[PDB]
Coordinates of all heavy atoms in Angstrom, one line a residue:
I1254 N -6.6 0.8 10.5 CA -8.0 0.7 10.3 C -8.6 -0.5 11.0 O -8.2 -1.6 10.6 CB -8.4 0.8 8.8 CG1 -7.9 2.0 8.2 CG2 -9.9 0.6 8.7 CD1 -8.5 3.3 8.8
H1255 N -9.5 -0.4 11.9 CA -10.1 -1.5 12.6 C -11.3 -2.0 11.9 O -11.6 -3.2 11.9 CB -10.3 -1.2 14.1 CG -9.2 -0.6 14.8 ND1 -9.0 0.7 15.0 CD2 -8.1 -1.2 15.3 CE1 -7.9 1.0 15.6 NE2 -7.3 -0.2 15.8
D1256 N -12.1 -1.1 11.3 CA -13.3 -1.6 10.6 C -13.5 -0.9 9.2 O -13.2 0.2 9.0 CB -14.6 -1.2 11.5 CG -14.5 -1.7 12.9 OD1 -14.5 -3.0 13.1 OD2 -14.4 -0.9 13.8
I1257 N -14.0 -1.7 8.3 CA -14.3 -1.3 6.9 C -15.8 -1.5 6.7 O -16.2 -2.7 6.7 CB -13.4 -1.9 5.8 CG1 -11.9 -1.8 6.1 CG2 -13.7 -1.3 4.4 CD1 -11.1 -3.1 5.8
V1258 N -16.5 -0.5 6.4 CA -18.0 -0.6 6.1 C -18.3 -0.3 4.6 O -17.8 0.7 4.1 CB -18.8 0.4 7.0 CG1 -20.3 0.3 6.8 CG2 -18.5 0.1 8.5
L1259 N -19.1 -1.1 4.0 CA -19.6 -0.9 2.6 C -21.0 -0.3 2.6 O -21.9 -0.7 3.2 CB -19.6 -2.2 1.8 CG -18.4 -3.1 1.8 CD1 -18.7 -4.3 0.9 CD2 -17.2 -2.3 1.2
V1260 N -21.1 0.8 1.8 CA -22.3 1.6 1.6 C -22.6 1.8 0.1 O -21.7 2.0 -0.6 CB -22.3 2.8 2.5 CG1 -23.4 3.9 2.0 CG2 -22.5 2.5 4.0
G1261 N -23.9 1.8 -0.3 CA -24.2 2.0 -1.7 C -24.2 0.7 -2.4 O -23.3 -0.2 -2.3
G1262 N -25.2 0.6 -3.3 CA -25.5 -0.6 -4.2 C -24.3 -1.2 -5.0 O -24.3 -2.4 -5.1
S1263 N -23.4 -0.3 -5.5 CA -22.3 -0.8 -6.3 C -21.2 -1.5 -5.5 O -20.4 -2.2 -6.1 CB -21.8 0.3 -7.2 OG -22.7 0.8 -8.1
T1264 N -21.2 -1.4 -4.1 CA -20.3 -2.1 -3.3 C -20.6 -3.6 -3.3 O -19.8 -4.4 -2.8 CB -20.2 -1.6 -1.9 OG1 -21.4 -1.8 -1.2 CG2 -19.7 -0.1 -1.9
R1265 N -21.7 -4.0 -4.0 CA -22.1 -5.4 -4.1 C -21.3 -6.1 -5.1 O -21.4 -7.4 -5.3 CB -23.6 -5.5 -4.4 CG -24.5 -5.3 -3.3 CD -25.9 -5.6 -3.7 NE -26.9 -5.7 -2.6 CZ -27.7 -4.8 -2.2 NH1 -27.8 -3.6 -2.9 NH2 -28.5 -5.0 -1.2
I1266 N -20.5 -5.4 -5.9 CA -19.6 -6.0 -7.0 C -18.5 -6.8 -6.4 O -17.7 -6.2 -5.7 CB -19.2 -4.9 -8.1 CG1 -20.4 -4.2 -8.7 CG2 -18.3 -5.6 -9.1 CD1 -20.0 -3.0 -9.5
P1267 N -18.4 -8.1 -6.6 CA -17.4 -8.9 -6.1 C -15.9 -8.4 -6.3 O -15.1 -8.6 -5.4 CB -17.6 -10.3 -6.7 CG -19.0 -10.3 -7.1 CD -19.4 -8.9 -7.4
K1268 N -15.6 -7.9 -7.5 CA -14.2 -7.4 -7.8 C -13.9 -6.2 -6.9 O -12.8 -6.1 -6.4 CB -14.0 -7.1 -9.3 CG -12.6 -6.6 -9.6 CD -11.5 -7.7 -9.3
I1269 N -14.8 -5.3 -6.6 CA -14.7 -4.1 -5.8 C -14.3 -4.6 -4.3 O -13.3 -4.1 -3.8 CB -15.9 -3.2 -5.8 CG1 -16.0 -2.5 -7.2 CG2 -15.9 -2.2 -4.7 CD1 -17.2 -1.6 -7.4
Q1270 N -15.1 -5.5 -3.8 CA -14.9 -6.1 -2.4 C -13.5 -6.7 -2.4 O -12.8 -6.5 -1.4 CB -15.9 -7.1 -2.1 CG -17.4 -6.5 -2.0 CD -18.4 -7.4 -1.5 OE1 -18.2 -8.6 -1.1 NE2 -19.7 -7.0 -1.5
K1271 N -13.1 -7.5 -3.4 CA -11.8 -8.1 -3.5 C -10.6 -7.1 -3.5 O -9.7 -7.3 -2.7 CB -11.7 -9.0 -4.8 CG -10.7 -10.2 -4.6
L1272 N -10.7 -6.0 -4.3 CA -9.7 -5.0 -4.3 C -9.5 -4.4 -2.9 O -8.4 -4.2 -2.4 CB -10.0 -3.9 -5.3 CG -9.9 -4.3 -6.8 CD1 -10.9 -3.5 -7.6 CD2 -8.5 -4.2 -7.3
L1273 N -10.6 -4.0 -2.2 CA -10.6 -3.4 -0.9 C -10.1 -4.3 0.2 O -9.4 -3.9 1.1 CB -12.0 -2.8 -0.6 CG -12.2 -1.8 0.5 CD1 -11.4 -0.5 0.2 CD2 -13.6 -1.5 0.7
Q1274 N -10.5 -5.6 0.1 CA -10.0 -6.6 1.1 C -8.5 -6.9 0.9 O -7.8 -7.0 1.9 CB -10.9 -7.9 1.0 CG -10.5 -9.0 2.0 CD -11.6 -10.0 2.2 OE1 -11.9 -10.8 1.3 NE2 -12.1 -10.1 3.5
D1275 N -8.1 -7.1 -0.3 CA -6.6 -7.3 -0.7 C -5.8 -6.2 -0.2 O -4.7 -6.4 0.4 CB -6.5 -7.6 -2.2 CG -7.0 -8.9 -2.7 OD1 -7.1 -9.8 -1.8 OD2 -7.2 -9.1 -3.9
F1276 N -6.2 -4.9 -0.4 CA -5.5 -3.7 0.0 C -5.4 -3.7 1.5 O -4.3 -3.5 2.0 CB -6.3 -2.4 -0.5 CG -5.7 -1.1 -0.1 CD1 -4.8 -0.5 -1.0 CD2 -5.9 -0.5 1.1 CE1 -4.1 0.7 -0.6 CE2 -5.3 0.7 1.5 CZ -4.4 1.3 0.6
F1277 N -6.4 -4.1 2.2 CA -6.4 -4.1 3.7 C -5.9 -5.5 4.2 O -6.1 -5.8 5.4 CB -7.7 -3.7 4.3 CG -8.0 -2.2 4.2 CD1 -8.8 -1.7 3.2 CD2 -7.4 -1.4 5.2 CE1 -9.0 -0.3 3.2 CE2 -7.6 0.0 5.1 CZ -8.4 0.5 4.1
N1278 N -5.1 -6.2 3.4 CA -4.5 -7.5 3.7 C -5.4 -8.6 4.4 O -5.1 -9.1 5.5 CB -3.2 -7.3 4.6 CG -2.1 -6.6 3.9 OD1 -1.8 -5.4 4.2 ND2 -1.3 -7.2 3.1
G1279 N -6.4 -8.9 3.6 CA -7.4 -10.0 4.0 C -8.4 -9.6 5.1 O -9.2 -10.4 5.5
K1280 N -8.4 -8.3 5.5 CA -9.4 -7.8 6.5 C -10.8 -8.0 6.1 O -11.2 -7.6 4.9 CB -9.1 -6.4 6.9
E1281 N -11.7 -8.6 6.9 CA -13.1 -8.9 6.6 C -13.9 -7.6 6.6 O -13.6 -6.7 7.4 CB -13.7 -9.9 7.6 CG -13.3 -11.3 7.3
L1282 N -14.8 -7.4 5.6 CA -15.6 -6.2 5.5 C -17.0 -6.3 6.1 O -17.6 -7.4 6.1 CB -15.8 -5.8 4.0 CG -14.6 -5.9 3.0 CD1 -15.0 -5.7 1.6 CD2 -13.5 -4.9 3.4
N1283 N -17.5 -5.2 6.6 CA -18.9 -5.1 7.2 C -19.8 -4.8 6.0 O -19.8 -3.7 5.5 CB -18.9 -4.0 8.2 CG -18.3 -4.4 9.5 OD1 -18.9 -5.2 10.3 ND2 -17.1 -4.0 9.7
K1284 N -20.6 -5.8 5.6 CA -21.5 -5.8 4.5 C -22.8 -6.6 4.6 O -23.5 -6.7 3.7 CB -20.7 -6.3 3.2 CG -20.2 -7.7 3.3 CD -19.4 -8.2 2.2 CE -19.0 -9.6 2.3 NZ -18.1 -10.1 1.3
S1285 N -23.1 -7.1 5.8 CA -24.3 -7.9 6.1 C -25.6 -7.1 6.0 O -26.6 -7.6 5.7 CB -24.2 -8.5 7.5 OG -24.0 -7.5 8.5
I1286 N -25.5 -5.7 6.2 CA -26.7 -4.9 6.0 C -26.8 -4.4 4.6 O -25.7 -4.0 4.1 CB -26.7 -3.7 7.0 CG1 -26.6 -4.1 8.5 CG2 -27.9 -2.7 6.7 CD1 -26.3 -3.1 9.4
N1287 N -27.9 -4.5 3.9 CA -27.9 -4.1 2.5 C -27.3 -2.7 2.4 O -27.7 -1.8 3.0 CB -29.3 -4.1 2.0 CG -29.9 -5.5 1.9 OD1 -29.1 -6.5 1.7 ND2 -31.2 -5.7 2.0
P1288 N -26.3 -2.6 1.5 CA -25.6 -1.3 1.3 C -26.4 -0.1 1.0 O -26.1 1.0 1.4 CB -24.6 -1.6 0.2 CG -24.5 -3.1 0.1 CD -25.7 -3.7 0.8
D1289 N -27.5 -0.4 0.2 CA -28.4 0.7 -0.2 C -29.2 1.2 1.0 O -29.7 2.3 0.9 CB -29.4 0.1 -1.2 CG -28.8 -0.4 -2.4 OD1 -28.6 0.3 -3.4 OD2 -28.5 -1.7 -2.5
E1290 N -29.3 0.4 2.0 CA -30.1 0.7 3.2 C -29.4 1.1 4.5 O -30.1 1.6 5.4 CB -31.0 -0.5 3.5 CG -32.0 -0.8 2.4 CD -32.7 -2.1 2.3 OE1 -32.7 -2.9 3.3 OE2 -33.4 -2.4 1.3

């Protein structure tokens, strides 16, 4: 997986981002655009 994108308001939860980043071995997530938008 080359890119991971966060969509929807609940992806703003820090623990959720941590679980997904840890699973993908420190891979940075695409989250700069408001997820709701």
